[PDB]
Amino acid sequence: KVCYFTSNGITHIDYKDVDLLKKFVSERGKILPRRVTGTNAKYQRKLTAAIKRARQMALLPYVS
Amino acid sequence: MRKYEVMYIIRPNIDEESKKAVIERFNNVLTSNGAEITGTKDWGKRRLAYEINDFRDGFYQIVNVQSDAAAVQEFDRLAKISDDIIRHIVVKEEE
Amino acid sequence: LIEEFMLVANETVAEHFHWMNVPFIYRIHEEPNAEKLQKFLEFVTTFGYVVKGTAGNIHPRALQSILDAVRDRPEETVISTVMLRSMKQAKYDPQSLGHFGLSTEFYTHFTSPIRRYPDLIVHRLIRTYLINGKVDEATQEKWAERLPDIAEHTSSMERRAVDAERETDDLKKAEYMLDKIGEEFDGMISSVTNFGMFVELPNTIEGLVHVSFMTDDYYRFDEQHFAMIGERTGNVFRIGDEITVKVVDVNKDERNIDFEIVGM
Amino acid sequence: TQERKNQLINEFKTHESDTGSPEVQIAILTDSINNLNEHLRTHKKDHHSRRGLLKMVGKRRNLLTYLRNKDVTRYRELINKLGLR
Amino acid sequence: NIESGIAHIRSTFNNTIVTITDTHGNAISWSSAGALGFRGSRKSTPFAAQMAAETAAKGSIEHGLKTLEVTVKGPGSGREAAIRALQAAGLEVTAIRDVTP
RNA sequence: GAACUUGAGUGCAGAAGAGGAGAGUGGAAUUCCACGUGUAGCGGUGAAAUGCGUAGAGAUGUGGAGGAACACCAGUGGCGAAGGCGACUCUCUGGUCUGUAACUGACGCUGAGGAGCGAAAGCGCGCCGUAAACGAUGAGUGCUAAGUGUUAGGGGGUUUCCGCCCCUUAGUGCUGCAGCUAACGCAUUAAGCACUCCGCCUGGGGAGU
RNA sequence: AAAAAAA
Structure with missing residues (x-):
């Protein structure tokens, strides 16, 4: 029950780092909730954006 | 002028002569409109997460720049027009 | 570590005696119940976990992939648990019918004869066949008669x-x-x-x-x-x-x- | 921009370390107002923005009037220098 | 002679229809619960969906399919059973996709 | 007249926002219509009609209606004066909070009228503009027990940091003293104790005539 | 409830 990004000290989430984001989507592709991941609020935001950028650029899917 | 990150995907059905021409074209666009290319990755042909314009793969180019809007804006304009670039995004580099 | 060292030995012994083609006791785990596993496959598709395979012909790895996917999730403990409730229990048998759970063709229990009687038998068959060299037809027919009753009883x-x-x-x-x-x-x-x-x-x-x-x-x-x-x-x-x-x-x-x- | 603002400060400032004088602030606001007004010529419907304007404009007025009552001299000077009617 | 395809599963409360297409959405084959002569409640049930999937699938295997993408529409109980019936008919499922409007 | 920095603001450093206005762009579905697949369904529902059709349709693409919205994330989370604001990117722009204390030196508060923003409707996109536009609770400032949660910050302690611990700021929650209350309740987010200014009321009906 | 395995 700890934040990835507060643990590992990661200030900047990147949309391009597909692997990293892939942790935080469901198998279907849906964004995983904060309560499941344990993410910090702040980052949950950052993370959401990135995935949203990602998905736009076809890096990630909207519906796997 | 302020830092942006352009990414874009080139259609997968081109040879490396054509591809280079694309890159040089669009690199020429930016620097023509007062941009300076600080970085230029090439992620190479990836599988797309879904099928864009009937292609399941594409060549990603990631240009860092520093420029005025005008530059980026011109790029975006042309990027849209072009059939070689299938999708793109410009993004500001958050401070 | 020890586990792994007990497993490979157990696998080694079983394979040796399979190829020797003498009456022997194995520790088998048959393929899961197709009806029970079908329901399990339905259950995991509700959480988003999609499995490659049909219930009648599932390879252990395909099950392992799931347990990897759910690792460090809230839904781990239960999908795990419901998977278990789709598996058959493992039993002793004279035939080498493989061990689903270990994904192996040959398995026995050799490594605890103090506390298990099938391990104590494996030792006696080792002594009989390997050490004494008693691979005669009468010795085989004696053991082929008695192991089914032993295997059923000990499994009980x-x-x-x-x-x-x-x-x-x-x-x-x-x-x-x-x-x-x-x-x-x-x-x-x-x-x-x-x-x-x-x-x-x-x-x-x-x-x-x-x-x-x-x-x-x-x-x-x-x-x-x-x-x-x-x-x-x-x-x-x-x-x-x-x-x-x-x-x-x-x-x-x-x-x-x-x-x-x-x-x- | 911050360079533009530093200009402004250097132009109006009453002494070396001054950024708090009406002068300064009026200067700044004034530009902001100006820049913003231009924004609203194009973006007529951007009400919200319009609101901040008013508050800007107001701030000014108070500062001018503060000044005009403190020292009319400085106030005359200023309004000439900024071109404020 | 096409190998890859989509299996469009429309599982309603009343019925299950199963169309199989090529990648360009041209119709290879189809079945439905009511095409197999189920009537009323029975068309709704997952057993009819299962059997509808098989019959759609067996028709596709004649046309020489191997791999499926699957799409699911509608709230019905048939999708789970129907999908398994596409795996059980032989055709490997690449990815299942809920495309409920 | 003169002096000051505590209120007010500007600097400088830092923080988070579905704040607003443009311009694209990503996916969705929608059914507008035609056409390529399609081959007998389909369709209610206790099950039969109700209906629906092989004139190849339910169904599946392809041209699209071309109009509305953007799931998961999403939280009595955040932002906004209110109405409100949730796809993504860029363009322009408003505000807020924290920290510093460098500067200005009371420059403040409220505010009738006025001006602007501002649902259904009303309807003729424009006027309209009235809104449980009533968390049923004007704004500002100071003072007056505690307990616990969350949002964005600041400092110190260990702690390598992560983590914990503590203190502080701003906001949002629950719980509860003093007091207040007709009771209900409120209780540092007051409906407590005060001062400033504004709005509003003085039986029901008639009559919002 | 319900699996190996260990003990």
Whole structure:
């Protein structure tokens, strides 16, 4: 029950780092909730954006 | 002028002569409109997460720049027009 | 580490005696029940986990892929648990029918003859066949007659042991929780039923939330999703949701623990 | 921009370390107002923005008037230098 | 002679229809609960969906399919059973996709 | 007249926003219509009609209606004066909070009228503009027990940091003293104790005539 | 409830 990004000290989430984001989507592709991941609020935001950028650029899917 | 990150995907059905021409074209666009290319990755042909314009793969180019809007804006304009670039995004580099 | 060293030895012995083609005792694990595994495959598709394979022809790896996917998720414990409830139990047998769980063709128990009788037999057959060199037809026919009765019996005595062991654990878990009546715990919904839902605590103590104690709404069980759904409130308690419970009643004799929902 | 603002400060400032004088602040606001007004010529419907304007404009007025009552001299000077009617 | 395809499963409360197409959405084959002569409640049930998937699938295997993408529409109970019936008919499922409007 | 920095603001450093206005762009579905697949369904529902059709349709693409919205994330989270604001990117722009204390030196508060923003409707996109536009609770400032949660910050302690611990700021929550209250309740997010200014009321009906 | 395995 700890934040990835507060643990590992990661200030900047990147949309391009597909692997990293892939942790935080469901198998279907849906964004995983904060309560499941344990993410910090702040980052949950950052993370959401990135995935949203990602998905736009076809890096990630909207519906796997 | 302020830092942006352009990414874009080139259609997968081109040879490396054509591809280079694309890159040089669009690199020429930016620097023509007062941009300076600080970085230029090439992620190479990836599988797309879904099928864009009937292609399941594409060549990603990631240009860092520093420029005025005008530059980026011109790029975006042309990027849209072009059939070689299938999708793109410009993004500001958050401070 | 030791486990692995006991496994490879066990696998080594079994393979040796398979190729020797003499009467021998194996430790088999047959392919799971196709009906039970089918339902399990349905169950995991509700959480989003899609499996490559049909229930009649599933390779162990395909099951392993799931257990990898759910690792460090809330839904781990239960999908794990429901997978288990799709597996067959492992038994002793004279035939080498393989061991599904270990994904191997040859397996026996060799490495604990002090506490298991099939291991003590494996040793006697080793002594008989390898050490003494007694691979005669009469020696084989003697053992081929007796192993089926041994294998069936010992397999029964194992199951007996497990059932009793567990029955004492549940009793002493119930004895532990007598003084915890009124205390709140965080737990996870391990199983959902038409009458209520089971919640496992962090120390693997399991207790029931009876639908009577769910006073906030009329809850209807959904069997397909594994969930109790409130009609009015629209509260949904599913398998693998974490909830906070309070200890209401514990019966030591019956080995019952009863919980009420404090919060989700 | 911050360079533009530093210009402004250097232009109006009453002494070396001064950024708090009406002068300064009026200077700044004034530009902001100006820049913003231009924004609203194009973005006529951007009401919200319009609101901040008013508050800007107001701030000014108070500062001018503060000044005009403190030291009319400085106030005359200023309004000429900024071109404020 | 096409190998890859989509299996469009429209599982309603009343019925299950199963169309199989090529990648360009041209119709190879189909079945439905009511095409197999189920009537009323029975068309709704997952057993009819299962059997509808098989019959759609067996028709596709004649046309020489191997791999499927699957799409699911509608709230019905058939999708789970129907999908398994596409795996059980032989055709490997690449990815299942809920495309409920 | 003169002096000051505590209020007010500007600097400088830092923080988070579905704040607003443009311009694209990503996916969705929608059914507008035609056409390529399609081959007998389909369609209610206790089950039969109700209907629906082989004139190849339910169904599946392809041209699209071309109009509305953007799931998961999403939280009595955040932002906004209110109405309100949730796809993504860029363009322009408003505000807020924290910290510093460098600067200005009371520059403040409220505010009738006025001006602007501002649902259904009303309807003729424009006027309209009235809104449980009533968390049933003007604004500002100071003072007056505690307990616990969350949002964005600041400092110190260990702690390598992560983590914990503590203190502080701003906001949002629950719980509860003093007091207040007709009771209900409120209780540092006051409906407590005060001062400033504004709005408003003085039986019901008639009559919002 | 319900699997190996270990013990």
